[PDB]
């Protein structure tokens, strides 16, 4: 099946410890591997209109939505200004604690570095990384390899 | 049905709100037409005006409206060009004797306050104001105003002048004293 | 993108409009105050999204609110907003 | 800039005074003509008559000489003059004030400007419509008033201009009794300077250069005893073109044209241009929502003055 998580083999609490010895003796002999999450960064035209009304702020005759302008931005580190600006508008109207996940956790958009290592080390849980996964959709590329 | 008139000009009808007899479809090629109900009834659209709204109304499904019937006044509708001009076509009746045939008497065109507009709509304001709700290309409504332009200013024989506007009825006077 | 006055709504001065995003997945309800032209004037009332691709759009003059929008997968959304 | 309700119910197009500056006559869309007084001691406008006239938005209306009496023509797009006379012996504001006198009906098109002559080549008038065609109109029956004979026809267009093009055309006389007839007749983006010849009909004369667009308003700046006639223009473009005139086959006299003055100040359409009694003040009203005035200082070149906003 589609790869989930290995508690969904598990059939009860009792069975855990010994369900993750049996883990362990599948990665220990090279059998299992995990699967990792990598997240880059993708900006559309939306995004890019309502920066260039911005910096303006300091065809036309049909709306086709299935042409988009898209953009990934692959190291948001060294972004320029305007992609700077980019990523600032891809959090608008999110709350304060998105904002906060976000601006601490920009400079490992970049597909390279997995989330379970960016939980492990800026000490964040599963749960504010799903929220910040489930708000950011279209604008965050999922890639998935160990 | 009452009739079946074949044109090709058969795209977003718009009734006028002063005169329901009169309708106003455009085309494929962008080529308005403002009708009368009656002379299809009975048959020529009353006007046609090549190329003025947008083209691709077979091909694309997604189209904004550039042209609105004014709801201020009657004999009036508005175009929208390129994104930075509204063309409001006044026009005049003349009735060869109930059907009034019709012709383009002015055009008055407004700057948009920003560029990139695809739609725009009227809001009726007192004293036979006009204002224009746009919606921009990237989905920013503004607002934006009709300024009052002067339409004669006459002078006097005592230096008075008198200023008569295009879009209201009272008329300004600077006197002498 | 859609601008659709609205009348036969509001007992006040005000003029109801309807919106649809350039996209075309939401319906945004207005409500615009003629007599004042400040771009704060267009005040945001509610906004119905989930919608695919809308092509159409229309609305009932008698009772208030009853919005009815196409769509070009083939189904006819009927609601309300006010 | 004190303001008073006219009282239309639709867009007020021309507006005019008269001989004596105390009565405006204002016509409108609404198919009514409008006439307002000056009271010496209310010092406002109030309304002396209002009644309908056409079946089509009345565009341009004309006051007469006062030493031939109280008669208002009014040209509309139902392609017919009509001539108002009035009888004091009536109630004002009644609608009976203004007693038609004729109807021109020689027009096959919708009329857009009307201008009676100077009081001394006699009740004369003239035409112009989306036909091409400048029509001049003779009271020559001293009893009534109701048998007005066309004299010229001339053909300022050679095709009528189309049902879905604008079109403006504008008339202005010359108030000169020491100088031929003349009649500044502007066509669709022409300006033509007409004389009466020595054979009685009409003439081409000259021909006033430029006018990239159209042309809104035509006035010949009033003589006031200088040797040079000037002419003020208003185009659809930005220009303000003031033309200056010098009078020296079948015609009594040659003129010349130089164009004195181009401004582009501004920035629109020059919808009116207008005259002082003594053509030393130019009224200019554009799309910038300013009026302009203009005067000649230190030279004859024309330069700008206080400035109008609305």
Known sequence: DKPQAYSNIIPSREHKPVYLNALAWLIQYGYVTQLLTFINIRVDKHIKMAVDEDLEKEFEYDDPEMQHDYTIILEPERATAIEKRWLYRCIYGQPSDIQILFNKLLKYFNGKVPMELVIIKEEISRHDLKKLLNALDKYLIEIHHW | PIYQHPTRLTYDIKLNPFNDWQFSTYGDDGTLAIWDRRKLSDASPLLTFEKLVGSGAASRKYMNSCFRWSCVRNNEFATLHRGDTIKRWRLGYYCDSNIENLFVSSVHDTNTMYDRVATFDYIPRSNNGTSLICMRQSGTIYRMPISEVCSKAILNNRNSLLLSNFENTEIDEIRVN | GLIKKVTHWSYDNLIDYLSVNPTRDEVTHYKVDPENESDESIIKLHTVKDFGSITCLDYSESEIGMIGVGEKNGYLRIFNIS | ?310
């Open chain 4, 1 to 310: 800039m004190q303001p008073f309700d006219s009282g239309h119910d639709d867009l007020v197009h021309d507006v005019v005074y008269d001989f004596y500056g105390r009565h405006v006559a204002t016509c409108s869309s609404d198919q009514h003509i409008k006439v307002f007084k000056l009271d010496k001691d209310t010092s406002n406008w109030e309304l002396s008559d209002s009644w309908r006239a056409h079946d089509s938005s009345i565009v341009a209306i004309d006051w007469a000489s006062p030493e031939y009496g109280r008669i208002i023509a009014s040209a509309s797009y139902d392609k017919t003059v009509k001539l108002w006379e009035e009888d004091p012996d009536q109630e004002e504001c009644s609608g009976r004030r203004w007693n038609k006198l004729c109807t021109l009906n020689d027009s096959k098109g919708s009329l857009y400007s009307v201008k009676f002559a100077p009081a001394h080549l006699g009740l004369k008038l003239a035409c112009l419509g989306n036909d091409g065609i400048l029509r001049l109109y003779d009271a020559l029956e001293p009893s009534d008033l109701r048998s007005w004979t066309l004299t010229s026809e001339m053909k300022v267009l050679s095709i009528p201009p189309a049902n879905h093009l604008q079109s403006d055309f504008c008339l202005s006389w010359c108030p000169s009794r020491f100088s031929p007839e003349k009649l500044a007749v502007s066509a669709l983006e022409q300006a033509i300077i007409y004389q009466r010849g020595k054979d009685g009909k009409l003439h081409v004369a000259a021909k006033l250069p430029g006018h990239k667009s159209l042309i809104r308003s035509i006035s010949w700046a009033p003589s006031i005893g200088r040797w040079y006639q000037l002419i003020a223009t208003g185009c659809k473009d930005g220009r303000i073109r003031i033309f200056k005139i010098t009078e020296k086959a079948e015609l009594q006299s040659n003129l010349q044209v130089e164009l004195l003055s181009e401004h582009d100040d501004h920035n629109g359409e020059v919808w009116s241009v207008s005259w002082n009694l003594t053509g030393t003040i130019l009224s200019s009203a554009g799309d910038d929502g300013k009026v302009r005035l203009w005067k000649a200082t230190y030279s004859n070149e024309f330069k700008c003055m206080s400035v109008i906003t609305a």
